[PDB]
Amino acid sequence: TSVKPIFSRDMNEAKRRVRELYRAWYREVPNTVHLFQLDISVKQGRDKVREMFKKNAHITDPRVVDLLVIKGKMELEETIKVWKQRTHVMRFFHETEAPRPKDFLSKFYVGHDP
Amino acid sequence: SNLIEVFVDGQSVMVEPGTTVLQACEKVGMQIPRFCYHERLSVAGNCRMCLVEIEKAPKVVAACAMPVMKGWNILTNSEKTKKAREGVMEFLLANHPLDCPICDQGGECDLQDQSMMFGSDRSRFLEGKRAVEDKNIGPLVKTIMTRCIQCTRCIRFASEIAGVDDLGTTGRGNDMQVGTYIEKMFMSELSGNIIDICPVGALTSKPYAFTARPWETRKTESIDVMDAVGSNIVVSTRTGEVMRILPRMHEDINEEWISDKTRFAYDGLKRQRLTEPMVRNEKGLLTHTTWEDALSRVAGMLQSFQGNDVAAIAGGLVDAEALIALKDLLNRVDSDTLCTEEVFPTAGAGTDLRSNYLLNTTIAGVEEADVVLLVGTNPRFEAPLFNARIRKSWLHNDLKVALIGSPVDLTYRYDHLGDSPKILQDIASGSHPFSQVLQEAKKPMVILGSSALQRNDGAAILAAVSNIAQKIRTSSGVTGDWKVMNILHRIASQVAALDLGYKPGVEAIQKNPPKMLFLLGADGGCITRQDLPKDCFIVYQGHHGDVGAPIADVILPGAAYTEKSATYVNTEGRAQQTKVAVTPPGLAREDWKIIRALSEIAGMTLPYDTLDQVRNRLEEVSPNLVRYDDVEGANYFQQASELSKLVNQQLLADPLVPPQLTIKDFYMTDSISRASQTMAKCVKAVTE
Amino acid sequence: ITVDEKLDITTITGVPEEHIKTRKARIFVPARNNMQSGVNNTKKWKMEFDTRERWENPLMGWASTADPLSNLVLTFSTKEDAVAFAEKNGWSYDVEERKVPKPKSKSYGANFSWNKRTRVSTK
Amino acid sequence: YRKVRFVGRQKEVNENFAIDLIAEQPVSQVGSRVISCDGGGGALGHPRVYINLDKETKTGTCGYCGLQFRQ
Amino acid sequence: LGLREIRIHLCQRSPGSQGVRDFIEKRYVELKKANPDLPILIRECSDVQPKLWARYAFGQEKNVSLNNFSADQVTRALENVLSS
Amino acid sequence: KFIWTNHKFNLSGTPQQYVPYSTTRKKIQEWVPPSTPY
Amino acid sequence: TRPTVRPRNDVAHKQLSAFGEYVAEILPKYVQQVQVSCFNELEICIHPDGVIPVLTFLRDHSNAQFKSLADLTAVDIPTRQNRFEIVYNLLSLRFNSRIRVKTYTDELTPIESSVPVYKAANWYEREIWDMFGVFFANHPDLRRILTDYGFEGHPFRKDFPLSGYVELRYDDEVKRVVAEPVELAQEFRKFDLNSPWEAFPAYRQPPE
């Protein structure tokens, strides 16, 4: 498709990029974990980062892989600074929300027709 | 080559020699406003709200009835037309009293969506307004005749399609009423369908009478199953409940018309209904138990029985997706001996190739047909839209009719040929005439029902009638192919419940004593507990409680026809999928999801979960149930014409009779009808 | 200029949540409410989703609900451009078909007839 | 089940009821054919609507108005 | 057990499948003139690979195919399972 | 007539705070099972 | 007709025919359509290429000043096959007129910032990145304005069901103010207002 790409060209400089800002996240999880005075096992903070970057795996295209970045490149602005107050962060790890069954026969006794 | 060009608003368009202005000016996308003109009816001239203005002639014509000659300039929008359509619709607001707060059509009416857009602004009268008086017809049509813009669209309809000729025009001058001179109540099928016709709020529906106004509802298309032709309906939902249902204007089945029974029967849907599972208890005790509890109660009891001792029979309106999950499950324990509640006599066919098993020439075939002979049925009260799809074609062009047995009241001039099974045979050669008339017929047709086919000699009449179809078809027999012999059912879901391969007729249980049955039938008085052996248990499954709710072991709920995305079939073998509307009440659940949670808690676990993994299974076991609404070319009754001649059985002797005669039994029949409390109002206004 | 042609079937991911694969949308031509004869409510191919449970709220009887879509109707202009928006946003769907009447043949003045069977009285 | 909410709260309900308060009216008569039902005083009340009383004995009170009306 | 049932799927056109259509001309009236028990099923259209299907032994599905054959090739292809 | 005699107030709990309820008839009318006999 | 109907004025409609005739004359590499709104306003349909270019011509000249940028905005149309739209809106202080500049786009195709031409598209471009999702390259800054820090949906486009996907509520089980999926106390009734008969003949869509 003819439209100018954003940053990358095909898939390599692109997949050099996603490798890159990983470390900015990987090098800085914990400085926050003492800064907000939020308490968690610092390794959790390194599981989620690696839990997300493995999530969107099937992407076939440039200008998508550049699009996601422009989001991801942002967040390091807010989080590495303090523009969030504890409660824009911890929302990643959902503490309160009761589990979903996701199995079959556990559904059939609770809830209609999902 | 036979067409005219005529310029509508300065634009050329082609029109067949003899279409009116209105059918031309529709082709380019305009509505001349309409009051007395309507497609499916005839045409008369007495609204005078379509005045088109022709080019270069001082008079103003009317665009309902008048042909269109070599090209006029048909000028819709000028300063001449706009001098009329403003000057009529200030007349018919002279007397139209000050309802609309409360006139129950107050959200659709056509003294409203004309007379803002087209026509006037304020009024100059200033004093007047006759008010006549109403009366009553029946416990459906509610009648305030104070309104009546007097299109005369309710009258040309009685003498037209539904053949009952009653309504009339009584009077002269400013005063003429409409309703009937004497006190006769006017009651029939399809004549509960008027209240689509009347363009203003004269005729408005009784049970619905005051509940909701029609900007609030939600139109979710659906399909009506109480009967063969199906429909295309549309439901409505206010708060999450059903309010009222319409037709959906399909172009073959339900021209614009929906029958009456399928309309006023939503009412027993929310009345008496079973909202939970109910355990067994040993006594007359029957109680409610948690959904996990009475599931296993019947789970283990399957690990006991085996072989033909466990057989299920489902004869009712059940879907075509709970006719697999139940078939594959009870057939993976290898116990079948299963049938439906219905009775289809079989000899050398009745499943294979089907060819005789469904109505061959579709509904849309009748329009072309020439000679018709139908036997052993009263087509009026079963498939009421196959009747008047004769009537309209009996008129509008010539058609001939003959019936066999028990002359009933139909709407058109037929003739009773003879009454007995023994008449059919002598018509093989010349006797008891037609003799050549079926023979000389260009497109003969023959229709056998499910009432006559259900006798104990049944496999004979199937084979006796097929002969006369072979008799003719082997000559030419039509032109041409033009299939002839065909059947019509009266039962909701059968052609699905059968051509899946479920053997016809309840016999296979009648020979032996199987211990554990599943009743989806379920309310026929066929199988009782007395007929069963000892108390070994039957598990009822279904939504209602009618008969077979008490006589049963453990029951399980279900969703009706408005709550589930299912697949039905009508008697041309289409596939129509009803669509979700309300979500089912209390604890009840869908049927084919109550199978798989019967399976996994027991031994075998069927190979699917979601819906699309049901229909792929529907796709293996049958190819055409996933082809929605297409009639594929099949004849294939040659090879079954001979093979069903195998058995030599001969008839009984006894005059044919239909179950339904004149009316009163039309209402309470299937399930929902029986519990519908408004039918309970119009059954006692019949007897007396 | 960096024109860089390629072909990857357009899809988009992550913005909604689980409602990507759970549901089935539907593309259908509205049917004309039949209590009135106005033919102008047709002509646009919309889409609307499946309906999930509305229950009762045990204080008043407002029927409160989840299923946060439940009320959207987009309006497209045609079929070729209809399916265009289900794939490009990546969820399942289904299709209906448009309907228009027979031609048809209606002539006043055939209502008074010598041997014809169509002859009206009290029209 | 539901009934534990207004415990001690005294449960406001409507002392009068109009379910039928109507029938106490001295159902009027005219001596003519059709009438003007504008109620409750001029230009406060239902829109003017004319009703026909010719039956034998009945009337018709227009249904906005409710007030039993006849000859 | 088996077997139990036999489902001959076919297509209305794409004549490459015509053997089945021809098979009915050839062996149906004759083939099922015996076996007055088995309920052979003709259903309509798989449009492609008119797979013959058969079911037995507690509902296990066994699907042979056919794509372009002659008349008698299938007549002998049926007794493959039917003898068993 | 059709209007009061004395008066009332807006009170916080009087004891009577009126605490509204639902004004409607029932909905689906569940089924009754059959009695003592088999 | 006079008393209640808005009296028209012709002069304003003659010139804005001319002065807009020839900005399809001197920049034909870009401008692909132009017209005159019956109320005496102009709409210039421009390819997405010229954005910085065309304005820059509109930025200064002695025959067209258009120094004052008033309103940048957007519209998002499905079944336009290129979703969104831009509309620039510019007032020329000397000549007393309004001329609007329409430029289409998609989500994926970037558009180039106008920021060096006017410094008042600084905010109006930060916003749109939040709402519709259009991505403006080479912008001195790109961030999140008008929206919270959680909205991953880009609302104002036509796929966001009005109530967003997560209601908020505070619970004392710990400290925080946390987010649970949206559960309403009333349906948000959907009424249906669209009446038949096509009251407008002039706008009559093609016959087809």
Ligand code: SF4
């Ligand atoms: S009936 Fe038709 S006209 Fe009479 S009030 Fe209701 S809408 Fe207005």
Ligand code: SF4
């Ligand atoms: S019903 Fe109302 S409209 Fe239909 S004909 Fe009788 S009066 Fe004229």
Ligand code: FES
């Ligand atoms: S519409 Fe003109 S005659 Fe009825």
Ligand SMILES: [Zn+2]
């Ligand atoms: Zn009154």
